[PDB]
Structure formats: structure tokens, C-alpha cells
Amino acid sequence: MKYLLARATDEEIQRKGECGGAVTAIFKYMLDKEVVDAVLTLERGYDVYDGIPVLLEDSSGIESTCGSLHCAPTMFGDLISRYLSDMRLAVAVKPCDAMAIRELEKRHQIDPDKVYKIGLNCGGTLAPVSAREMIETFYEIDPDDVVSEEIDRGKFIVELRDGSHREISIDYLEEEGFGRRENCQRCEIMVPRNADLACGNWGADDGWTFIEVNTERGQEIIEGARSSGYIEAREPSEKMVKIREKIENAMISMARKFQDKYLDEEYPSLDEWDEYWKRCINCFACRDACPVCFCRECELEKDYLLESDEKAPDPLTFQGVRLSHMGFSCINCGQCEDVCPMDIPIARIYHRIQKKYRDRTGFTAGVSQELPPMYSGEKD
Amino acid sequence: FEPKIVGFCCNWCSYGGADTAGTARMQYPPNVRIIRVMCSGRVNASMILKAFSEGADGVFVGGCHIGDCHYDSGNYKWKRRARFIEDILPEFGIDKERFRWEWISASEGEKFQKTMQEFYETVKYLGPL
Amino acid sequence: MVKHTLCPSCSAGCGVNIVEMGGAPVGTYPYRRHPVNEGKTCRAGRDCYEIPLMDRVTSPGVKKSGKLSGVNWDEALDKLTELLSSEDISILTTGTLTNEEALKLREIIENFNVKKSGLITVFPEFDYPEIDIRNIRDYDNIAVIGDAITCAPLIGRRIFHAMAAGAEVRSYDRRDETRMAVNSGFHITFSDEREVLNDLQQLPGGSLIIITPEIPEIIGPVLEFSSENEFDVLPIFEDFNTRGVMQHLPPVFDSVWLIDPGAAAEPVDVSGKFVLQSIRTEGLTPDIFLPVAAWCEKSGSYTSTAGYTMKLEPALQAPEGVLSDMEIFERILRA
Amino acid sequence: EPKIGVYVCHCGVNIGGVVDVEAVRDYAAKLPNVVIAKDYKYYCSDPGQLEIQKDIKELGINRVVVAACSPRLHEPTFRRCVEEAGLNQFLFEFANIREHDSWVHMDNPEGATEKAKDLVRMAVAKARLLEPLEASKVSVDDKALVIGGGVAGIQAALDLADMGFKTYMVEKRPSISGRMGQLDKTFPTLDCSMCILAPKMVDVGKHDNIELITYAEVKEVDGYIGNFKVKIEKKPRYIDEELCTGCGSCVEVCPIEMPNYFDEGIGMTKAVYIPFPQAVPLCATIDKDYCIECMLCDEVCERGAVKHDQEPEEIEIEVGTIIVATGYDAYDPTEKLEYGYGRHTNVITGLELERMINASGPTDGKVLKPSDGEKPKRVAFIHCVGSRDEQIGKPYCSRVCCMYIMKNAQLIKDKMPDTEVTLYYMDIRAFGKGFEEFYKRSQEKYGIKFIRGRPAEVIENPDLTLTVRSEDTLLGKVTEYDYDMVVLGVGLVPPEGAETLRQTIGLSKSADGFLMEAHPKLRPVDTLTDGVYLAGVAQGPKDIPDAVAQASGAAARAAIPMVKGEVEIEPIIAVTDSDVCGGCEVCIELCPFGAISIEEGHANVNVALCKGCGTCVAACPSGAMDQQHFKTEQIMAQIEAALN
């Protein structure tokens, strides 16, 4: 079974689920049947803009984790490698989460045996505060009234407390400096085929989740969840499986256009990069947030590299060194740019360097299961 | 303008090549300073970036010819790193002409002398970094 | 596991998530939803999770001969009541209590008659405006006294935003090589406060004066100048809840009761008895120690320099044997 | 705290002529941690060495910097000088101011002097951070293991045993001999092959320095050179090797018929069998895939050597060197569907023909048609079956098929003068000694016909004759000739279980699928895995004399370390900090000598296997790996000194 249409058998889960609640039903089955010891997911805080990671040990009250949070640009790989390493686990992953976990698994920081990946289709995420400012400026509503959010026919659309829907073309918002994160606009991966399962709504009807099973482990998950009646499944029309392929191809083409824009046409000049690098406060937030920078002790803090004075570091010994260390394994997750207190576009340069390396060698960070050719023991 | 050039030369061939050039009394500009390593596989991007950040106008790396490595594969790893470094360097305003990596054998004194002369001329033409 | 809280390492109201495993803090996670920083933090904000575990003392202590020795809560409370009620005490606090705790301590002070009281701060009592830092970019002219970028990096971020949007930024300091001096549009190194005042003479109305504690002598005049010439003043206080504590207590020795649940007190001069109510006692040798709960182990509200108030629930469980400052205060009052 | 003494050598007028040695010494005197800075005319001499030794002894110097000529010329000299002075030889640094400065900048005395000052500064910067290192000594056990009991393995074992080294030979088959014992005659001399091989097999079987373990396989190999621990699984013969005499009574009374592995699928034997009369050891073996436990062998055996209750045995040996001599398998042409091997009755391979022509083979030396058991009147031979063919991924030449095809054609003509033999070839590779004369004699003496053309197809006729559809490229025309028998010149492939053994030992294979040598030209029998050597066809296809030469060479190379009894390793090796190592393992595959392993989630460098290149050190991101005498801090200090 390559493709399925699944939805939860519990009425509460399907009601609260974004797309029929199949993902929540899989997690509930996995915890209830003890396939895994825990589930790492998101859970909204005091509003839709506040998604906090949660590690559930049992399925009691799991429906609180239902729904999609487009304003939660979270990374799970770093949490799975820092603290959850010796646990059997099931985690909801966007394609960037799966890419980070794959890059960490090929470096033996995460055990692929112990981690189950129910990946989600991702068309992009938004920064919460920026999203609220956008809703105030363009939707002319109080952001606290928004109860849900989705992107679709090119449209950010918001469900409301009243019950209506407000729609704005995402092209307009992204041309006005808003909308999805800039790294999300360049994202070339939409279905997480580097995960065990790939669940989305691009080939599904209302109330159903379109699932692509990528691995035999995904097949075991789906079989165990259907046999016990946690999930009910049907098979997409192959007219649907083609609409999904076309949508994905269009999205990837738009991503390539945005790469040509941000990394070639609107790429800052050397003078603009000098202006940016003058700002750096040497806080190492980019290094800490980067999932691929996992080392117990970092070379950038050695006496012969670290900037001693309270001034901007030399861009070479900080940025160029981190680039030489991991820029072939950059997954364009944007976390480094997200956390930078100085608003430096780090991800642009790191993604451009990774793209040059990929064009030369053909290595895709976060997708290929092997190490980069840099670490090849052959004499290729 | 006298450029400052830092060189890394493997013990077995490229250091031997510079020694051969010296024994034959082949003259090249005094700008280069050579640091000795056992293999070019010892060199990484950190060394090159440090040299450029400490004030080097050009950086030279000299290894054994592909297939001649005294440790049988070190220059392959170095070549990979050198290509990636060529990718990285222009992103920070360093012309990749300032970074020269060559294969020199222990008997190629003339090759070493010519490489040093041309690298010095190139870096001098480029000007201060 | 992952719980919201406020970074206590400076006055900027940055939010951070503390990751908890097994009942102890193990790391930090971005708090993107917070409007002050949006999940961005300096190095100090990403190391704060270690504060509850660094040299933590969870047993009330008393000065036996020479060294401190453990005792129970009732004895220490009674012997503090002794000094409070009979001989004399000066109560000093840092900007590290909650607003409710500040109100309770103000009640304690007036009732037990403390002549000398207040908050340890170099800033005066001023009609400080509420200035949401998101609006700093809207100001046409900004003057900075001190190194605002280094004191609170996440407000220097907003200064950078303002410079991007055309705001003319001028910086004044005694030093010529500082991050603000380096990055501002124009910098003036001055040896006389008169030069700073003369330069501020040209600032149009509604301009923004961001003043740090680097130069304590010019704070008084500048505030005065800002009241005469109709400027908006953003102070950068020393402690995370200095502005919240300032409301209930005024800015302040023989015998001192020092309350600093955040351990943010630069050493002060004590001649007589020393009653320390903090989380760690490494620096000094107090006569009696009152271990309290940390910033993140309390229920209550904090106000940042800009004025952003934030109500907080306990992100961590207070260690057994310690009490929140308000419990100690209520015991002192009721006992 | 470092206390550095700097010594500038004039070299007569070679350095002092261009470089102002006095100014360089003065500059060196001021550098931090430099206590004394002298200069002498010839520091490579007893006077200069005595001056250096005297200052070491008198001024309490712990670091020495000589500014002179190449480390490559006189580093051992000054290392010996300082060590005799009592100072560790790795607390000495060299600055090259003659080949790198004074002989190449004769036109710029000022530039030469400034460059000399810079180089001395770099040398002092490195010296300040040097540490004392001691060379390590690794004991080498004087016992060897030879895997494979063919002609190459037999030769290697005999050579090692005759040099006095106790040897263990391990052979998976019940008897030693390999493929050479299966041949009837050898090219280019047509000499009886078993009659030259059998004496060597008997020698191996009763040699005092050889322990022969037949019918056993190498299960595990751990350790390194001189320190190999090998676990061997001796499969149950169900016959007592000590009591059995090989009389063969048990074989006669066995009611079960089983294929004989020695006959390559055209001869049969019983479930209890002796592979051939000249087997070493001459012992019986029972195969339990065919035994019915009738017990007839038990009541007929006169020595009580039948043991149906036998169990597999485990042998643990400790050796110093391993020689892999595992040989080859014949290519299986069943996949070449156009030639119809396995479908057409009268299509056979070259090895089957070797067994058929053999006078002790299943047919008693008579070449007969498998269909009707009659002598073929017409025989065709096809070259390059399974070789030089990219449709099957075998783009190499097996190097022996031409010669054995011609040998078998000559043997057929000798046995059957009136038979007609034709060979279909692309190239005739008669390259060895006497091979070209063999080629000519195939035509002049025996009248064998040679057609240049790779046959397109072999078609079976209803009467079971075979039509070979092939172009005669020299006549330039398609030919369809009929034959009573077609023989396929199958190539050489690595044997079954080659990959298992290769992973067990940790060796690397070449493109053609065979084991890889350390250097193609100058180290044909060595491997990058210290203490392991290759002999014979294990390294790649070749004929008997080449395999014998390789086996003797492998014996010599293995004996050298065992003769020495120890190996000295220079301490410029890599070292891992387990506190910083994240266990990412990206360094493991970068060592060409396999010196790095992972224990307890951290990288460990084997001291005996590290050559000190520094590739793993440069690859480690976090810096948990560092090279002694070339630490990252030292090189960074040198860079800073060179530029500042």
C-alpha cells in the first residue's frame, strides 16, 4: 500500500484533527499498544500562535495535540538528540524535522531503530509575532479572534471566533515582507519521504488524511493501527493521486524560483554582508539552534578562533569555519536565522553554499542516507 | 606592495620540492612562508581561514600528485576540502585566485619555483586583501 | 517538560522556554511567541536554565562560631523578628522580587518601622513612559547614552530596526570602541556631561533617549533635560524586575536585611548584622541565611524596562526547604 | 614553562653569506621564552653538537630550535644530539633557512634576513607548545596463519615452516590441493600436475612446523599485526581423523550416491567419501545431507573411526601474520542464455573438461559426449566466456583461459588424433614463458583450427549436435558449423564466501572483485591492513608459477616482522579525547590503514596501526582528534607567527 486515505475511529479525534485525525490515531495506537514509549508532538499554548513541544507518555487526553499549527516553526531533531536519545519514540515531523533527524542519524546522534517518523506535508510556516502583525495589518481583525490558519489556493486563510473565514493571497503578503519564512519559500521538499509515513491533505477529501507509506516500518504502523480499529482506511482515486503530484510539482517549481530570487538576484552584495557582519554579537544562538551543530565542544570557542574582545567577530573564523564544518549538510530549516538577535540572514548564505556543493557533487542534505562525499573513504 | 603569502607543504613531496628548488639555486620571491605538515590531508579549512584572517594576502597548499601520497589517500581528502574551500572563500570577499593548491613532487624544483613566481605575481596584481 | 518563563539576566523582558527532565532544568528552547524578543536571546538568555542549580543552598542557616550552620525555619524567622522589632534594620532589595512580593515587603517595612528601605538602583524616581520596544523603530531621532547593545542586546536589535527605517541614531559614551559606538550613525566621546547636554539641545520633541546605567552621573541631569524638552526616556535598569519593584518601593549602612532571590546584588557595605534572603550565599558570610525560591519557581508578575508586564506560573518546582519571599514575609508579619 | 634555546647555523658561507646570522640571533634573543640564542659555523659537527649539548646541560633548556637546513637532511642528527643531552627528541624544532631562504633569495639579502627572522619566529612559536613523546614498541608473535590450501597456500605454508615459524593452515575443503589438484596436465609443458603437486601436499601433511586444519573455516579475526586472535570452526567430519586410514572400505558399502565436489558436477561418490586418492589427509568424510544412518560404515570400519555423534569444534589461535590464499571459483555460464549452458546436453565448461580428461576422473580419462557417452568427433572451444563482457559486468580478462583452452585442445588431439578441434577467440593471450610456442604448436603439430570471432549463439539441433553461429571476422562472413561438443572457456571469479572472509579480516576488494594489494606496482602481496598478505589468485587471476612466486613473496614479507619480533611506531600518531568525542564516526573511514575503531561510543586510534598522516585530525569537526607533534594549536601558532 503506497497510498491511503485514513481517518480516526474516535469521534473526538476526528473532530479535533486537522485532516480526519489519522496522525493522532496512529500516535494513540502506538502508545496504547506500547510500540513506542513516548510521542513527541506540538501542543498549542494559550493561543494558536503558541505551539510548545510536548512529550506524551500515555494517550490520555491526546486530542489536545490535534490540529496543524502553521505558526510553529519548530525543530524536533535537536530535542531528540540532546535529551531523548535513549527512548523509543514516535515524533511528528515536517520535512525539515525529518531532514535534521536524518543528518543526525547518519552521524550516530539519533538511533534510527528507536525513532518512528510520521511526517507531515509542509507548505511553509510563519513566525508567530509576524503572523499576528500580518493579521492586524491586512485582515483588519484582532489576532486573538483567529481560531485556526491554513495556506491553499495561494491563500493564507484564517478561521475566526465568529465562525467565518478570511482569505488573502499569499503572493501579496510575501511581496509585502510577510507570510511564510524566507527559508520556507525556498524549501524544495513538501512531502516527507525521508520519514516512515507522509500525511497530508493534497490528495484527500474533507475529513480524510492522504497517507503515503514510505517504508516497511510505515506499513507496520498502518497495519497495526487499522487492525485494532484506531484508523479506518480507504484508497485514494488515482485521479486524486495525480492532482497531488501536480500540486507538489508546482510547489517545487515555485520554490526553485524563490531560490533563484533570494540566493541569486536579491542576495546581499559584499558591502551589505559587511554591514550585516558588523552587527554580530558573538552570542552563538545560530550555532545552538542549528540541528547539524551538535558537538559537545565547539571549535569556534577555541582560543585561536574565538573573538576575545566585545566586538563583532571576524566573519571568516566564525561563519566560514562553521560553513566548512557543516555547510554541505545544511537543510535550510532557518533556525539559525530565526534565533539571531541581530537579524542577520545566515540561512541565505548557508543554503547558497549547500546548493553549490549539491550542484557540484549531487549530495542532498537531509535526504540522502549516506554521509557527504567529503567523508568518503574511497579514492573517488 | 609586498603581499604576505603563507604556504603549507607536505613533508614527503612538496617540502621536498622546495628543498630541491633550493639545492639547484632556483630563485623565487621571498614573500612565501612555508609551514611543514606530514601530509596535505592534515590541512583543513580552519587553517586557510585563519591564515587569511591573520593578514595573509595569498595562501598556498602543496601536496603530492594524486596517486603519490605517502599515506596513500591523504591528498584525496585534501582535494575535496580544497574544492569546498574554493566554494566558501568568495562568499566573504576573498578572490579564489588568492588560494592556490598544487601537486608538487620532491624532484620538481622548477615546478615549485615557477608556481611561486606566478602566485606572487598574481597576488601582487590583486593587491591588498 | 517545556515551560515558559522570563530571562532574568537583564532588564529586557525576553521570554525563554526551560526544558525540564526528571525535575531539574536541562536546557532552553526558543519562546517564539513572546513579543519582546520572538525567541531570540543572547548568550546570557540561553544559559539561564542553570541558575536554579548553581551553588544552590536550600537550608536556613545561622552564624555559629566562625562558619554558617544549619537550623530550622522557625528559629531563623524568630531571630530575624528579633532584629526587626527591637534594635534596628535597614531593608534593601534588588529588582528580583515579584510585584506582589514587593507590595508585601512595603507593608512589612512601614509596620515594623524601617527608617531606611528601598531598592538598590542608580536610577531616580521618574515618570517613565510605557514604550513598547516594537515602536522604537517609529522614532525619527534616537539618542543613546551608554552601551545599549551590550547592556540589553534585544533592545539594540530594535535600535538596528530603527536605523534601518531612517531614524537618525546618535550615541554618547566615555568610550570610543563599543558596539553602540561602532554601529550608531554618529558617536561622540565626551569627558564633560555639558557636551552631552548641548548635543541633546538639538533633539526635536518626541525623540527617544535610551539611557543605560553605564554613566550614573548623567542620568539625573538627562532625565531633568527630558522633562523640560519633552522627550521619551527608555531606561535600561540593572535587574530583570527593577521597574516592577520600583512601583512599590523607592530607590534607596548599619544592619542590613538584603533580599535578592536572583543573586543580582553587587556587594554593599554592611557594618552590623547581615540577614541574607537569596538563593546562593557563595560571595559572603551572612549572619543568617534565608534560602528562597528562584525567579522561575514562583507565581507572580514581572515588569521589564519598557514596561511590559508578564504573569508567570512556576516553571520549576522549588527545592524542599526553601520558601518564596512572600511566604517569609507573611510569616514575619503574622508571627 | 618553556625555556627555548635558539641556534643559528652559518653553514660556512652558505647561509651567512646571504642571511645576516648575527641579526637573526639578536632577534631570536628577544622572543619570549628564549633564554639563549647563539650561532656557530657548522652546527652539523661534533663541535656544534657539543655546544648544543652543553647549553642543554648547563642552562636547563627544555626546548631546542636549530635554524639551518632541512629537517629532511639533519633532523635525526639533532634529535640524537638532544636525546644524548638528556632532552626528549620531540622537544626539538627545526627552521629551514638555507634551502627555503638563503639559496633561493640570493638577490635580496634584506628580504632573506627578514624571512629568516620570520621562520625562526615560527619555529619558536611551535617549540613553545611541544610535548615529550615516546615511541611505542609492539611485540610480534612468530606464528602465522595461511587461509587456503591450494598451491599458493601450500607454497606459503611450506616456505614459512622451513623458515622456522610455526604455521597454521586452514582449508575449508576436506583435503588440500585446490584447483591445481583437479587439473590433468599443465600448460605449456603438458606435465602431469598431481605428480608434482602430491609431494608438496605430503610434505605439508607431515611437516613438524605446520598444523593442518582441513574442513574448517575462519569464523572470526580480532586484533592487529603480531597480535591476531583467530576463531576457527572445524566442521564435523563424522570420522575420527586420527583413527581413519583412508582405506576406503566405508565408501564401498555405502548405499547412498552423492555428487563429488572434486569432479565439479560430472562425477559421483557416496555419502561417505574420500575426495581423491592423493588427498591430504587421507581421511573419509560423511555428508549428512545424504546420510541415512544405515550404520554399514560403522560395522565395516576396522579402526572404529566412524563417529555419527561428532560435533563442530572451536579452535582459538594466536598468530602474528595472516596470508590469504583462498583462490577462485570458475565462472558459472548459466546466465549466458545464448550459449545454452545447463540447457544443451553437450555444452560443458573448461573445468568439467579438465576433470573428464583426467585419467582418474569420473570417465577414466575418456572425453565422452554427456548425451550418449561417445567420443565427440567435432569439438568447439569458445574463449572469454564470462570475461571481457560488460553485459554481465565482468570487464576483465581472466588471464588463463586462452592457455588452458589450447592445452585441452592439444590433450584431446593427443587422446583422439582424428577428432577435429576449433577455437573461437577474440585475442590469443599467449604472453607467458613458452606460451607463444605453445600457441604455434597447437596449429603446426596438432592441426587445431582457430577462428577469430566471438560466437553469437549456440543452437541445439534435434539430434543434440550443436551449431555455433559466429562470424569469421578474418573471412568477414557468418559461419554455422556443427559440433558434437562445445566447451566454454569460463573465466575466474572470487570463490564462494569471499565477502564473508573479507569482512572478517577487514580487507578491501578491487574493482574486479578480488582482494586489493597495498600498492599495485611495488607492494603486490602486501595489504594496507598490517600483518595480512595476499598470495595467488586471491589477489587476482593468474597461472601456477605466478601464484607460487606470490606465495613465496608473501612468506618473505610475513617473515620480516616475525623475524624482527617487534615493530617501532613513531609517536606522531593521532589521539582522541573521549570527553570531546561525540561518537559521530565520520573519521573511521578516512583512515586508509584502519587504525580507528569505535569503543564505548568513542573513537580509539590503535597505536600500532597509525602512520601519523593527520587526515582524521583534519576531518574531525569538534577537535576531539589531535595529532601529536602536529597539534592544531601548534599549527595555528605557526600561522600567527608567520603573519604576525
Ligand SMILES: Cc1cc2nc3c(=O)[nH]c(=O)nc-3n(C[C@H](O)[C@H](O)[C@H](O)COP(=O)(O)OP(=O)(O)OC[C@H]3O[C@@H](n4cnc5c(N)ncnc54)[C@H](O)[C@@H]3O)c2cc1C
Ligand atoms: C505547518 C504545517 C504546514 C502544513 N502544510 C501542509 C501543506 O502544505 N499541504 C498538506 O497537504 N498538508 C500540510 N500539512 C499537514 C496537514 O495539516 C494534514 O492535514 C495533516 O498533517 C494530516 O494529519 P492529521 O490531520 O490526521 O493530523 P492531526 O490529527 O491533526 O495531528 C497532527 C499532529 O502534528 C503535530 N505537529 C508536528 N509538527 C507540528 C507543527 N509544526 N505545527 C503543528 N502541529 C505539528 C501536532 O501537534 C499533531 O500531533 C501541514 C502541517 C503543518 C503543521
Ligand SMILES: Cc1cc2nc3c(=O)[nH]c(=O)nc-3n(C[C@H](O)[C@H](O)[C@H](O)COP(=O)(O)OP(=O)(O)OC[C@H]3O[C@@H](n4cnc5c(N)ncnc54)[C@H](O)[C@@H]3O)c2cc1C
Ligand atoms: C580450467 C583451468 C585450467 C587451468 N590450467 C592451468 C594450467 O595448465 N597451468 C597453470 O599454470 N595454471 C592453470 N590454471 C590456473 C591455476 O589453476 C591457478 O593459477 C591456481 O590454481 C591458483 O592456485 P591458488 O592456490 O591461488 O588457488 P586455488 O587453486 O583456487 O586454491 C584455493 C584454496 O583455498 C581454499 N579456500 C577458499 N576459500 C576458503 C576459505 N574461506 N577458507 C579456507 N579455505 C578456503 C580452496 O578450497 C582451495 O583449497 C587453470 C585454471 C583453470 C580454471
Ligand code: SF4
Ligand atoms: S523549511 Fe520546508 S519543511 Fe521546514 S517548515 Fe519551511 S516549508 Fe516546511
Ligand code: SF4
Ligand atoms: S545552517 Fe541554518 S538553515 Fe542550515 S541547518 Fe543550520 S539552522 Fe538550519
Ligand code: SF4
Ligand atoms: S561549528 Fe563545527 S565544531 Fe561547532 S558545533 Fe558546529 S560542526 Fe561542531
Ligand code: SF4
Ligand atoms: S545568532 Fe546572530 S548575533 Fe548571534 S553569533 Fe550567530 S550571527 Fe552572531
Ligand code: SF4
Ligand atoms: S537581552 Fe537580556 S533578557 Fe534578553 S536574553 Fe539577553 S540577557 Fe536575557
Ligand code: SF4
Ligand atoms: S646544519 Fe645544515 S646548514 Fe648547518 S652546517 Fe650542517 S648541513 Fe650546513
Ligand code: SF4
Ligand atoms: S551411515 Fe550414512 S555414510 Fe554410512 S553407509 Fe549408511 S548412508 Fe552411507
Ligand code: SF4
Ligand atoms: S572410516 Fe574406517 S573404513 Fe572408512 S575410510 Fe576411514 S579407516 Fe577406512
Ligand code: SF4
Ligand atoms: S585469457 Fe584469453 S580467453 Fe581468457 S578472458 Fe583473456 S582473452 Fe579471453
Ligand code: SF4
Ligand atoms: S574523533 Fe571526532 S570525527 Fe571521530 S568519532 Fe569522535 S567526534 Fe566524530
Ligand code: SF4
Ligand atoms: S592520523 Fe592518519 S594514519 Fe593515523 S589514525 Fe588518523 S588517518 Fe589513520
Ligand code: FES
Ligand atoms: S604525503 Fe604529501 S600529500 Fe600525502
